[PDB]
Amino acid sequence: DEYSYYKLKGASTQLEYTKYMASTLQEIAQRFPDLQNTGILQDLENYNKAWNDFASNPNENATKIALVKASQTLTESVNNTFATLDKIQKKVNDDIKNTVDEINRIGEEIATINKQIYGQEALPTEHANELRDRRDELELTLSKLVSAVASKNEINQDNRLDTTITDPGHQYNLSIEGFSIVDGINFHPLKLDYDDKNKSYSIYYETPDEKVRDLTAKISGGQLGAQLDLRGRNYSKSEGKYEDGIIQGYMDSLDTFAKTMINETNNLYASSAKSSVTSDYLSGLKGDIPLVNYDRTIQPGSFDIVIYDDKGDKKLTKTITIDVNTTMNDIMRQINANTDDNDNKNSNDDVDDHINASFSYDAKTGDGLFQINAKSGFKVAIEDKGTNFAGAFSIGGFFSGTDASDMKVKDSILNDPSTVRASSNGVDSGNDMANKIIQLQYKKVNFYNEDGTIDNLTMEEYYRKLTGKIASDGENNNVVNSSNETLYNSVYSEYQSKSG
């Protein structure tokens, strides 16, 4: 009857893990329905149709306003969808603190019970058994929360010993990951702490000499094990997110969705000539950092700075090359060089430079900034050949941002939709660039995942892969949960049968 009770605790630990897991994964799936034309997919469709209406009538300023309107709706939808996952992750983080608080109350109440059971005084038989009943009750409740090891040696009432004294630590020990929460009559709590203002709770066992044993990566089982696996266990203060975790993995795919959407759209829109182009603020971009190391989506290759006059004729092309050592200073050295051995038209005409290109790092802000201002009578564009240099840095881009939470339309476009162009040459007439953005919705593009894989899909296919992954996780867990219930009921019936 004591052995089946040992099985009941283990059955509870497994069932409460998958039960908490099922509740959280079901909520996430309700937020991310694996259905076409809902949520972001519906906003993405209205966004692409808005590009189609604009490419049909690029001179009508009303279609520019409608396009910017549908783009802001899309980015905001991407912001809110990420905020939904962020809120659930913070909810799990708060549950971790509550569960740890409950674990400590249980352990303290068990250690206090043990002070009577193993105390010097003799207790009435009935009071001793109801204290023992309560301790078994608390032990069983504890198994719903965490995997804990209770090692017990039971007292023999043959007497033949008194007056002696009791060694309570040898009679009862309750441990978590090997560390004694209850050592006989002594209570040792789990400790919570955090370092940044996300209050990413870490779980510690502290020794009497204030030495620290972090358990965040080791604690498993029950509600706490599921909370840790959902939220993430290794927090990173530099990056302000978790290095693992089921929910964290959904957030990273959502960021990778936005990052690719920003990169691939901006790569195309950067090829539309403009009077000047300005990057976003590039946080931490010193002039000596290799570009492929600053942004993992930057690939070796080349892009061409392209110069047009105000009537829309291509006057110039300067090819800038990126390899795995190319820094921003290196980009400037190539831009600010001369040579240019070319043979355009006509009569050896191409002369000097028609742009003022600039990079600057603000040591007080920690941000870098890249600008190319074409001189009056000229426009500048960037046509990339694999690097995503302009797209990742939003040089002449349509979208700003780096992830799902800061994705937005570029401010100069939001503030004046009439600045939107559809043509490569910058004249407010053609539509060869906007047609490329329309076709981009069908194109297999790269998604650089945090796990190290590179998905090659369309935007919609990648997002549906995320909602399918969430549904597949919730279903796989439902199978493990289902067998956990049957095992729990079977063990619970055996426990009831083998008792009173």
Author numbering: 70 to 569
From the study:
A special junction to assure a smooth connectivity is needed to link the hook and the filament, which have different structural and functional characteristics. The junctions made by FlgK and FlgL play important roles in bridging the hook to the filament. Once the hook is completed, FlgK starts appearing at the top of the hook to form the first junction, followed by FlgL that builds up at the top of the ring made of FlgK.
Here, we solved the three-dimensional structure of a major fragment of FlgK from C. jejuni, strain ATCC 700819/NCTC 11168, using X-ray crystallography. The remaining 58 kD fragment, named FlgKcj58, has 511 amino acids (See Methods for detailed experimental procedures). The crystal belongs to the orthorhombic space group P21212 and it diffracted to 2.45 Å resolution. The structure of FlgKcj58, in which 11 C-terminal residues were not resolved, comprises the fragment [Asp69-Gly568]. FlgKcj58 can be described as composed of two domains. The structure of FlgKcj58 reveals that the cell-proximal half of the protein, which includes the N- and C- termini, and which is known to connect to the hook, is structurally conserved when compared with other known FlgK protein structures. Domain D2 of FlgKcj58 has a different fold compared to domains D2 of FlgKse49 and of FlgKbp64.
